[PDB]
Each structure stands twice: as structure tokens, then as C-alpha cells.
Amino acid sequence: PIDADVTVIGSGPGGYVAAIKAAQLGFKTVCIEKNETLGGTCLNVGCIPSKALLNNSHYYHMAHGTDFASRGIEMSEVRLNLDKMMEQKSTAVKALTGGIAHLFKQNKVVHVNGYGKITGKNQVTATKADGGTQVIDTKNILIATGSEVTPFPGITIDEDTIVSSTGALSLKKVPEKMVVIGAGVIGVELGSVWQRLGADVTAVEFLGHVGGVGIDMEISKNFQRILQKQGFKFKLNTKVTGATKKSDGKIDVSIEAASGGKAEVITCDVLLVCIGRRPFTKNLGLEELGIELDPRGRIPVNTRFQTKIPNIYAIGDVVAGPMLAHKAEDEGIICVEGMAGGAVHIDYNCVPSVIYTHPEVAWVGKSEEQLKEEGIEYKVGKFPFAANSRAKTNADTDGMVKILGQKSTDRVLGAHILGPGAGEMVNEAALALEYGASCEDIARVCHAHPTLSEAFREANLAASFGKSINF
Amino acid sequence: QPIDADVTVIGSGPGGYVAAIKAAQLGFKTVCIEKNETLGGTCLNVGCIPSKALLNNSHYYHMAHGTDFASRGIEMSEVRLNLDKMMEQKSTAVKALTGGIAHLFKQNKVVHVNGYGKITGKNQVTATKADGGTQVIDTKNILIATGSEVTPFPGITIDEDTIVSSTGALSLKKVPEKMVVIGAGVIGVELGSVWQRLGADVTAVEFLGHVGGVGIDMEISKNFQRILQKQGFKFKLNTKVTGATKKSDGKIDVSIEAASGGKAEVITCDVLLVCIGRRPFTKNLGLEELGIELDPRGRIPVNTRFQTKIPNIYAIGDVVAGPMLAHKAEDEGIICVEGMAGGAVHIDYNCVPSVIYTHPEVAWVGKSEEQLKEEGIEYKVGKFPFAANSRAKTNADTDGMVKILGQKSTDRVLGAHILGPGAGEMVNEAALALEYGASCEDIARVCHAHPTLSEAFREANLAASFGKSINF
Ligand SMILES: Cc1cc2nc3c(=O)[nH]c(=O)nc-3n(C[C@H](O)[C@H](O)[C@H](O)COP(=O)(O)OP(=O)(O)OC[C@H]3O[C@@H](n4cnc5c(N)ncnc54)[C@H](O)[C@@H]3O)c2cc1C
Ligand SMILES: Cc1cc2nc3c(=O)[nH]c(=O)nc-3n(C[C@H](O)[C@H](O)[C@H](O)COP(=O)(O)OP(=O)(O)OC[C@H]3O[C@@H](n4cnc5c(N)ncnc54)[C@H](O)[C@@H]3O)c2cc1C
Ligand SMILES: NC(=O)C1=CN([C@@H]2O[C@H](COP(=O)(O)OP(=O)(O)OC[C@H]3O[C@@H](n4cnc5c(N)ncnc54)[C@H](O)[C@@H]3O)[C@@H](O)[C@H]2O)C=CC1
Numbered sequence: 001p002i003d004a005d006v007t008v009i010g011s012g013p014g015g016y017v018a019a020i021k022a023a024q025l026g027f028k029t030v031c032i033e034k035n036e037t038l039g040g041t042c043l044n045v046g047c048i049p050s051k052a053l054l055n056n057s058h059y060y061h062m063a064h065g066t067d068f069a070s071r072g073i074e075m076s077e078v079r080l081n082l083d084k085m086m087e088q089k090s091t092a093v094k095a096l097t098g099g100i101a102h103l104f105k106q107n108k109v110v111h112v113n114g115y116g117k118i119t120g121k122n123q124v125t126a127t128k129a130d131g132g133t134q135v136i137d138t139k140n141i142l143i144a145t146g147s148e149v150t151p152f153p154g155i156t157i158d159e160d161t162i163v164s165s166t167g168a169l170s171l172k173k174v175p176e177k178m179v180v181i182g183a184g185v186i187g188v189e190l191g192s193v194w195q196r197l198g199a200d201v202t203a204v205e206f207l208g209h210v211g212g213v214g215i216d217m218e219i220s221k222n223f224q225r226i227l228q229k230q231g232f233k234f235k236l237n238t239k240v241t242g243a244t245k246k247s248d249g250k251i252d253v254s255i256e257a258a259s260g261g262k263a264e265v266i267t268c269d270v271l272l273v274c275i276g277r278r279p280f281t282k283n284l285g286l287e288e289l290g291i292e293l294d295p296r297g298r299i300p301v302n303t304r305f306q307t308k309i310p311n312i313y314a315i316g317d318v319v320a321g322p323m324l325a326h327k328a329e330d331e332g333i334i335c336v337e338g339m340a341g342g343a344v345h346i347d348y349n350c351v352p353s354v355i356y357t358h359p360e361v362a363w364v365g366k367s368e369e370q371l372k373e374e375g376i377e378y379k380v381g382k383f384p385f386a387a388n389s390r391a392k393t394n395a396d397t398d399g400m401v402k403i404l405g406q407k408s409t410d411r412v413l414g415a416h417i418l419g420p421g422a423g424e425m426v427n428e429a430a431l432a433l434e435y436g437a438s439c440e441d442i443a444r445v446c447h448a449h450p451t452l453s454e455a456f457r458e459a460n461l462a463a464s465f466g467k468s469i470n471f
Numbered sequence: 472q473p474i475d476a477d478v479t480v481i482g483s484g485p486g487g488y489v490a491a492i493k494a495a496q497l498g499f500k501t502v503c504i505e506k507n508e509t510l511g512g513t514c515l516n517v518g519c520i521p522s523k524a525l526l527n528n529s530h531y532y533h534m535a536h537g538t539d540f541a542s543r544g545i546e547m548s549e550v551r552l553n554l555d556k557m558m559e560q561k562s563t564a565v566k567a568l569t570g571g572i573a574h575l576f577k578q579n580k581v582v583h584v585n586g587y588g589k590i591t592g593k594n595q596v597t598a599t600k601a602d603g604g605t606q607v608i609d610t611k612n613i614l615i616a617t618g619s620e621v622t623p624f625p626g627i628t629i630d631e632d633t634i635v636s637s638t639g640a641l642s643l644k645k646v647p648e649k650m651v652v653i654g655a656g657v658i659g660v661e662l663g664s665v666w667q668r669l670g671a672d673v674t675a676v677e678f679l680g681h682v683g684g685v686g687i688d689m690e691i692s693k694n695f696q697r698i699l700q701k702q703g704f705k706f707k708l709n710t711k712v713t714g715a716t717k718k719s720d721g722k723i724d725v726s727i728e729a730a731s732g733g734k735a736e737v738i739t740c741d742v743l744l745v746c747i748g749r750r751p752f753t754k755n756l757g758l759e760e761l762g763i764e765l766d767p768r769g770r771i772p773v774n775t776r777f778q779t780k781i782p783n784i785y786a787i788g789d790v791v792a793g794p795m796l797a798h799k800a801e802d803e804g805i806i807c808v809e810g811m812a813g814g815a816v817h818i819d820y821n822c823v824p825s826v827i828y829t830h831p832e833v834a835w836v837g838k839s840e841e842q843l844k845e846e847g848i849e850y851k852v853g854k855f856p857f858a859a860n861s862r863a864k865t866n867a868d869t870d871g872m873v874k875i876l877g878q879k880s881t882d883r884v885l886g887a888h889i890l891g892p893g894a895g896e897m898v899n900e901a902a903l904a905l906e907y908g909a910s911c912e913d914i915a916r917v918c919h920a921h922p923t924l925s926e927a928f929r930e931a932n933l934a935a936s937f938g939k940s941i942n943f
């Protein structure tokens with residue numbers, strides 16, 4: 001038996017960052033993790049492995065395809081060694097999970113390996129796999145249990161032939177034909193990876209656009225068109241009726257128009273189900289404790305991230321807001337800062353979103369649909385990467401930067417990027433929004449030449465003054 | 472056949488062509504005069520554009536030919552260099568972009584005059600074509616954007632064949648077996664890297680004790696140098712080249728010695744790259760008759776509206792004081808023209824970033840530790856290595872760090888220095904931060920997307936502000 005000031009259940013982005021920050025703040029900190037490694041979804045079956053595969057597959061594409069040759073890099077033959085590519089992936093995951101073990105040690109956070117359950121308003125009991133337990137009496141409890149894949153009823157995931165993103169990140173062979181349910185972020189990212197390695201990919205989507213919630217429709221549309229030219233096929237506004245695994249090993253996927261009718265069947269070698277994720281809170285002790293979940297399974301919390309019980313908090317994927325890793329970490333940090341007395345404030349309008357395909361997609365702030373729905377009078381500035389010096393020099397010119405500015409004050413209301421370097425570029429945009437900067441502000445900042453950031457600068461100039469210089 | 476205008480821009484490089492476009496968009500009847508066969512000045516034709524094309528292609532060659540792709544399961548038979556094809560990619564880009572300026576001039580009503588321009592009156596410019604033909608332009612204002620030229624090394628004459636300036640270095644016909652570079656400045660390091668990557672044995676000889684040129688932070692420079700040396704790039708610091716001579720052999724012997732004197736010796740190479748700097752170009756512009764005197768470095772003195780001694784005659788870009796960079800010239804051109812239209816004119820050279828496009832890249836804006844020291848500014852430091860950055864680790868590109876310098880009391884960011892992947896792009900968020908007078912805390916508190924290289928920027932500010940970053 002042992003005690004602490006703060007007990008965080010979960011070693012994911014929200015959890016481990018919170019543990020560390022609480023420790024650095026002067027709290028006696030304990031972190032409970034049920035899995036064999038720290039890092040949660042992001043490190044082990046999420047962010048890290050997916051980006052590694054996105055990265056390696058893109059490079060395979062450049063070598064195997066036409067890009068490298070056009071640059072004077074001639075190679076007789078280019079073959080995929082999926083075993084070694086997955087190896088690179090695993091190496092990154094092993095190194096980063098180790099890093100957290102080292103960081104906990106460095107900040108003297110204590111690692112309790114086991115399945116935690118809140119056994120008392122000031123206690124958490126960690127029951128290992130061998131039944132051997134451990135008790136932790138603490139002043140505050142921080143729930144950072146995260147999420148799990150959202151199952152598709154009627155279809156049972158077996159991570160072999162019918163998989164979730166977890167199975168898809170470790171496919172043993174490039175599937176010949178792959179069907180993806182859900183043309184969201186995972187769908188487009190994992191679909192793209194396997195499409196590049198040689199699979200024939202079709203994403204089936206219930207809604208009428210790709211990219212998930214909050215993406216700007218014009219950007220979503222241009223993105224789809226580019227992916228389609230890459231080989232990626234889409235069936236939008238389509239519902240999946242069901243799926244059956246056949247004795248020959250193939251999988252039949254029944255579909256129909258979302259508005260009924262147009263029955264069809266798609267046959268594939270691998271089915272990837274990715275229609276979202278949901279908060280994971282089972283056997284945590286909330287029903288017992290009195291913590292009622294909302295209809296969607298999230299733990300309700302106030303502006304300081306505390307539950308019904310004033311000393312029990314919840315952050316990350318287990319609570320409302322975008323289910324993203326940087327969002328979970330920020331909440332962890334501010335939640336424990338709040339525990340130490342500081343103010344606690346987060347503005348989800350300033351949390352960016354990134355899609356790590358190629359081209360990448362990234363945005364922060366409002367989409368045009370949001371502004372029209374809100375009756376906002378705004379201005380639009382667009383700048384194609386085809387007119388950007390660095391993009392043209394690199395011979396990688398798909399897409400554009402689109403800026404939405406308030407008509408009255410020129411304040412940047414939304415930044416949307418489709419193209420090279422979008423993921424890094426959106427952070428200059430997040431910073432701008434944090435200060436309430438104007439389109440003109442950005443346009444007058446001296447950006448390095450030649451860089452992709454200049455497309456960003458010119459789109460702001462266009463939004464502000466009406467015309468950019470290079471287009 | 473005289474033509475008239477409100478603004479006549481002499482020169483079509485970054486400064487000039489942007490100023491011409493901006494002036495036209497503001498409503499001025501605008502003329503842009505260029506003596507070369509194409510538009511775009513140094514940057515587009517023999518500078519920024521072709522060097523970045525080669526830097527990009529040579530890096531990819533390295534990733535393929537070397538061990539990188541192999542480590543990712545991308546197995547290749549025999550990676551080979553088709554120098555002709557690679558030079559073609561570089562050229563296709565230069566042609567496309569230069570043609571783009573011509574189209575933008577047309578779209579914006581800018582009148583392009585081909586010929587060597589000379590100010591022949593307070594309100595007149597005459598452009599003389601190759602065929603001796605003449606075009607006169609009566610104009611309300613004159614904007615000198617004549618740029619620069621390579622600084623010659625006395626005693627060594629460049630022939631763009633075996634003894635080259637950056638221009639010949641950008642079009643070498645074959646990979647040199649051995650190459651020596653005079654000057655470990657930005658060009659020396661970038662082009663030296665290009666050729667090194669393509670198979671050349673490269674050594675840069677530098678008179679000073681560090682690589683990277685003026686302004687680079689010393690800690691950053693030494694870390695950069697060490698990383699380059701691990702790549703095979705050789706350096707002879709605090710060493711001066713006393714001369715070069717070409718043998719019947721075809722090779723060239725370079726006599727060098729300690730910068731202070733003595734230690735004399737000779738080294739030999741196939742190609743000699745002379746890049747000891749660039750200088751303002753104002754030749755035969757008519758400045759002497761106008762009474763417009765140059766400063767000691769050959770630059771045109773201008774006031775805060777970029778006006779020369781004669782108020783309706785202006786100068787911007789490489790011909791005037793400040794960093795000789797393309798973005799600097801472009802900004803000076805825009806604000807200069809905005810001023811001509813009565814608006815405020817403001818530029819703070821402390822917020823003009825600098826980038827070195829090697830791999831890893833180097834980027835900075837604001838002050839270096841040495842500048843803050845000589846200025847007496849009390850400051851604190853925040854560092855974060857790319858080895859602890861998630862995007863950097865997953866991509867196996869972990870060299871470097873971000874270093875933030877904040878004012879000890881106010882926590883205001885005073886300087887940002889980045890060594891590693893994505894530096895060139897990342898420095899722009901830093902520049903936005905400096906413009907706003909951000910504090911290290913302001914930065915650490917903005918939500919940066921995970922996983923991005925930019926998180927290193929965030930963490931380093933967190934370290935400078937709070938004392939510790941989260942992931943290191
Ligand atoms: C394939 C994929 C790719 C992704 N890519 C990105 C990306 O590029 N960028 C981004 O921002 N987001 C990405 N995400 C989403 C991101 O991973 C999640 O938003 C993030 O991990 C949420 O963090 P968290 O700390 O709240 O929860 P999680 O990381 O889901 O979980 C934290 C930990 O809680 C543990 N836990 C749960 N209950 C208990 C208990 N009772 N006792 C002990 N331990 C417990 C879990 O085992 C887990 O390790 C991706 C997700 C997937 C699936
Ligand atoms: C190899 C190399 C790489 C570089 N890389 C970068 C980089 O990555 N980033 C960066 O910011 N900077 C870089 N630079 C520097 C950058 O190119 C210059 O700072 C920039 O071109 C300056 O712009 P400018 O408009 O003042 O002058 P310039 O572009 O030098 O010249 C403008 C024009 O003036 C014309 N002209 C001159 N006199 C007359 C006359 N009398 N009549 C008519 N026309 C005339 C010239 O022919 C030229 O076309 C690089 C330079 C070199 C040499
Ligand atoms: N790069 C990044 O930032 C990444 C973030 N993530 C995040 O992880 C979480 C889960 O990702 P996803 O599973 O992709 O969720 P998502 O919401 O991004 O995409 C799910 C897709 O499935 C569609 N859908 C839902 N039900 C359906 C049905 N019955 N039939 C057909 N289509 C249906 C949704 O409209 C959506 O297009 C999200 O928060 C996502 O943003 C995941 C990968 C990468």
C-alpha cells in the first residue's frame with residue numbers, strides 16, 4: 001500500500017504528460033497503466049505507428065514511381081520489403097515507449113502496472129493480471145483512460161482479415177483488394193498507406209465528404225479529388241449493409257445508397273472498419289462512485305476538468321472535445337496546473353487538426369460552412385501551392401492555402417491547408433489565432449524565401465488586401 | 472517613342488519584380504526594366520531556386536543511394552546518378568518560375584522593358600538594348616532594385632569552368648572528384664553539401680572560426696559544423712586562401728595558411744568554388760551624375776521610406792543595407808511602394824529570418840547569444856533536442872535542437888535558433904511570435920498539433936519559460 005497527491009489512471013498522451021507535469025509541479029505522483037507499455041493509443045497503435053507507415057510508404061512511392069527518376073535518381077529495380085518496413089515502424093514505437101519510462105523515472109513519477117479501478121473517493125486499486133493487487137490512497141484522481149475502436153454492429157473485428165486500425169498497422173501482407181468503412185482521418189491515412197504499397201483501395205462513407213468532422217467542404221472536395229487521382233476510390237453517401245467472410249477467404253461487403261436502394265456488393269481481401277472511436281471507461285468504478293456518463297459515454301467535467309466528485313478529474317479521449325493527442329496533452333497539463341491553483345482554460349477553436357496523407361491536410365479555426373451557419377460576414381483568400389516557389393522547386397505542387405477573415409476587423413477566423421507541409425504550417429496559424437491576429441498581421445510578417453510558409457503568408461495577403469503578389 | 476510612368480523599377484529580381492507588381496496593384500502606372508534575358512534576378516536564375524532544387528534532389532539521392540531507404544524496406548538494385556536528368560529538373564523549375572513572373576507582369580499591367588537602364592534625369596530612365604536600341608521612360612519615381620554580384624577574390628579569376636562562383640557550381644557538368652570551397656558561409660555550406668552528396672570530396676576553407684556566415688548563433692554553428700563533418704564535409708577554419716593556380720594537369724593547387732599568418736601549405740582539387748560573399752551592383756546606373764554617393768561597401772544610402780538623397784528616387788534589396796536575402800528585398804519593395812502611396816513604412820531587420828537549406832536545416836530570427844551578450848541583455852535559455860521530438864523520431868531524422876533565448880525578467884522571446892529537420896519552415900512561426908512580442912510562455916501555451924516537428928519549438932519555449940520541457 002502507498003499514497004500520493006495525484007493518481008492518474010492512463011499512460012496515454014493525456015495521462016503521462018499530466019503525470020510528468022504534476023510531478024514537476026511538486027505533487028507526489030503515481031501513474032497506473034493496464035497495458036504492457038506506456039504511451040496509450042497514440043504511441044502503440046496510433047499516431048506513431050501510422051505516421052511511420054505513412055512516411056515509409058510515401059518514400060516507397062517516390063522511389064518505385066516516377067518521382068525519383070525525374071530527379072536523376074535512376075534505379076534498376078525497386079522492391080517492397082514489408083517485413084523491414086514494419087520493422088522500422090516497431091523500432092520507433094519501442095524507442096518512444098521506452099522514452100516515457102525514462103521520463104517518468106526522471107521526474108520521479110511512480111509507475112503502477114495494472115488495471116486501475118476507483119475503489120473509494122480517495123483511493124484507486126490496481127489489480128494486476130496475476131490477481132496480485134496494489135492500493136493507492138490519493139488526494140486527487142485523474143481519469144485518463146482514453147478510448148477504444150467503435151465497433152460496427154453485425155461485423156466482428158478479428159484483426160486478421162477484418163481489422164480495426166490496430167490490425168491495419170500490422171497487416172502481414174499487402175492486401176490485393178481492401179475495403180475501408182469510414183472515410184475519416186484513419187480511413188484516408190491507412191487507406192493511403194496500403195494503396196501506395198499496392199492495394200486496390202475503396203473507402204465506403206456514409207456522409208458526403210471525406211476527412212471527418214470539421215473539415216472545410218471545399219478543402220475536403222479538393223482532397224478527395226487528389227486522392228482519387230492517386231488510385232484511392234470512394235463510395236460516398238453509402239451505407240454498409242453487412243459483411244461476410246467467405247470459405248475462400250475473401251470478404252463480401254454489402255452496400256446501399258445511404259438514402260436507401262442501390263444495393264451492391266464489394267469483394268475484398270481485407271476489411272478495415274474505422275467509423276470512429278469512443279471513450280473507454282469500463283470496470284473503472286464510475287457507476288459505483290456515482291459518476292454518470294453522457295449518452296455518448298464521455299465523463300462530464302467542468303472547466304477545470306473535474307467530475308461530480310471535486311477531487312476526481314477526467315481528461316483526453318474520455319471527455320468531450322476533439323479526440324486528438326495534442327488536445328489530450330494540453331488538457332492534462334492545464335488540469336494539473338489547475339490542481340496546483342492556476343487558472344484553467346482551453347479553447348477548442350484553437351486546437352488544430354492534421355491529416356498526414358500526401359498531400360497533407362491541416363486546419364484550425366472555422367470552416368466556411370461554420371461561418372455561413374453563424375451568419376458571419378467574412379473574406380476569403382486563396383493561394384495555390386502551384387505558385388509557391390518552394391513547392392514548385394520541389395516539384396510537389398498539389399493544393400492550396402485558404403484563409404477566412406472577418407470582414408469588419410480582418411481577424412483570421414480560419415486557416416485551411418491542402419498540400420505540402422500543411423501539418424507544420426498549421427502551427428503558425430494556431431499561434432496567430434491565439435493572439436487574435438489579423439490577415440494583414442500575418443501578411444506583413446517577413447517569411448523566409450523560399451519556403452512553403454509563403455503560401456500561407458500570400459493567402460493572408462489575398463484575404464486582407466484582395467490580391468496576393470504571386471497569383 | 473518615349474513612354475511615361477508613375478514608377479519605374481530598375482531590376483526584376485525579388486525586390487524589383489514584387490515592387491513592380493505591388494505598385495501596379497496600388498494603381499501606379501508601372502514600368503520594370505531588366506537587362507538579362509529572363510526576369511527574376513539572382514534568386515530565380517542563379518540563386519535561391521536552382522540551389523534549392525539541387526539541395527532537394529541531392530538529399531533524395533543520398534537517402535536512396537545510402538542506407539536510409541534500405542532501412543525502411545525500400546530495396547533497390549543499383550542506385551545511379553543521372554546528373555543530366557537532375558540538372559534538367561532544376562532547369563525546368565527555373566524556367567517555369569521565370570515565365571511565371573512574365574505572366575504576373577501581364578496580369579498586373581506592368582510594362583516590361585528589356586535593356587540596361589540608366590537614370591538620365593531626375594525623372595527619366597533610359598534603357599539601352601543589346602542592339603543599341605533605345606527606350607526612354609519619363610517617370611515620377613524611380614526604384615533602384617539593381618541587386619548584387621559575386622564578390623571577386625583578388626588574384627583568382629573565375630572562369631565558371633574549373634574555378635567557379637555559385638553560378639558555375641550550380642551547373643557543373645560532372646561531379647568533381649575533389650572540391651575546395653573558399654568561404655564556409657551559407658553558399659559554401661549549401662553547394663558544398665550538394666556536391667559532397669553526389670560523390671565529391673569537399674573541403675571548405677574559412678578565414679573565420681565558424682561556419683554559416685554572419686549572425687548565426689555560435690553554439691548552433693558548432694553543432695551544425697560537427698554534423699556536417701560527420702557527413703564527410705571537411706573544414707579548414709581560421710585559414711586563409713593566399714592564391715590558386717591551375718596546372719597542366721588540369722587540377723588546381725590552392726595555397727592556404729593560418730588566417731593570422733604562417734602554417735603555409737597547398738591542397739589540390741578538380742573544382743575551386745569561390746564564394747566569399749556578394750556585393751551591391753550599381754554599375755553605370757548614373758548615380759555619380761545624380762550626386763548619389765555610395766557608402767564604403769558600395770550600397771545606396773536610403774532613409775526610412777527608402778528614398779535616396781533625391782526623394783523621388785528610391786533603392787531597396789541587395790543594393791541597400793541589411794541582410795542580402797530574397798525575402799528582405801521583397802518586403803522592402805512592397806513597403807517602399809506602399810510608402811510612395813502615402814502609407815507607413817516599417818521593417819525590423821531583427822525579425823527577418825535566416826535559413827540554411829542543408830540537411831539538417833539551420834534557421835534563426837531575432838538575436839543570437841553573442842548579440843545579447845554584447846548588448847548587455849540579461850537572458851535565459853531553453854533547449855529541446857529533436858531526438859526527443861515524436862515526429863522527428865518516427866521519421867528517423869533526429870539531428871539537432873531548438874534553442875530559445877528569452878529576456879530574464881519579462882520572459883519575452885528574444886531569439887529562436889533551430890538546428891534540424893523542418894527548420895526553414897518552423898522559423899516563420901517564430902517570426903510571427905517575435906512580431907507580436909510573444910513571451911516564451913505564450914508560445915508554450917498554444918496548442919501545437921501532435922506529432923509535429925513544431926512541438927520542439929513549443930517545448931523549448933516551455934523550457935525557457937517554466938524551466939523544464941515535458942518530453943526531455
Ligand atoms: C491509428 C490511429 C492514429 C492516430 N493518429 C493521431 C495523430 O496523428 N495525431 C493525434 O493528435 N491523434 C492521433 N490519434 C488519436 C490519439 O491517439 C488519441 O486521441 C490519444 O491517444 C488520446 O489520448 P488519451 O491519453 O486520452 O488516451 P489513450 O491514449 O487511448 O489511452 C491512455 C491509456 O489508458 C489506459 N487505460 C484505460 N483504462 C485503464 C484502467 N482502468 N487502468 C489502467 N490503464 C487504463 C489504456 O490502456 C491506455 O494506454 C490516432 C489514433 C489512432 C487509433
Ligand atoms: C547561389 C545563391 C543562393 C541563394 N539562396 C538564397 C535563399 O535560399 N534565400 C534567400 O533569401 N536568398 C538567397 N540568395 C540571395 C538572393 O538571391 C538575393 O538576396 C536576392 O536575389 C536579392 O534580390 P534583389 O531583387 O535585390 O537583386 P537581384 O535579384 O540580384 O537583381 C535584380 C535584377 O537587377 C538587374 N539589373 C541590375 N542592374 C540593372 C540595370 N542597370 N538595368 C537593368 N537591370 C539591371 C539584374 O540583372 C537582376 O535581374 C542566394 C544567392 C545566391 C547567389
Ligand atoms: N492525424 C490525426 O490527427 C489522426 C487523428 N485520429 C483521430 O482518432 C479518432 C478516430 O478516428 P476515425 O476512426 O477516423 O474517426 P473519424 O470521425 O475521423 O472518421 C470516421 C468516419 O466514419 C464515418 N462513419 C461513421 N459511421 C459510419 C457508418 N455507419 N458507415 C459508414 N461510415 C460511417 C464518419 O462519417 C467518418 O467519416 C478521431 O478523433 C480522429 O480524428 C485518427 C488518425 C489520425
Ligand SMILES: NC(=O)C1=CN([C@@H]2O[C@H](COP(=O)(O)OP(=O)(O)OC[C@H]3O[C@@H](n4cnc5c(N)ncnc54)[C@H](O)[C@@H]3O)[C@@H](O)[C@H]2O)C=CC1
Pocket residue numbers: 653654655656657658659661676677678679683684685710711712746747748749794795796825826827828
Ligand atoms: N539559404 C539562404 O538564405 C542563402 C542566402 N545566400 C546569401 O547570399 C549572400 C552571399 O552568400 P555567401 O557568398 O555565402 O557569403 P557569406 O557572407 O554567407 O559567406 C562568405 C564567407 O567567405 C569568408 N571569407 C572571406 N574571405 C575569405 C578568404 N579569403 N578565405 C576564406 N574565407 C573567406 C567569410 O568569412 C564568409 O564566411 C549572403 O547574403 C547569403 O546569406 C546565399 C545562399 C543561400
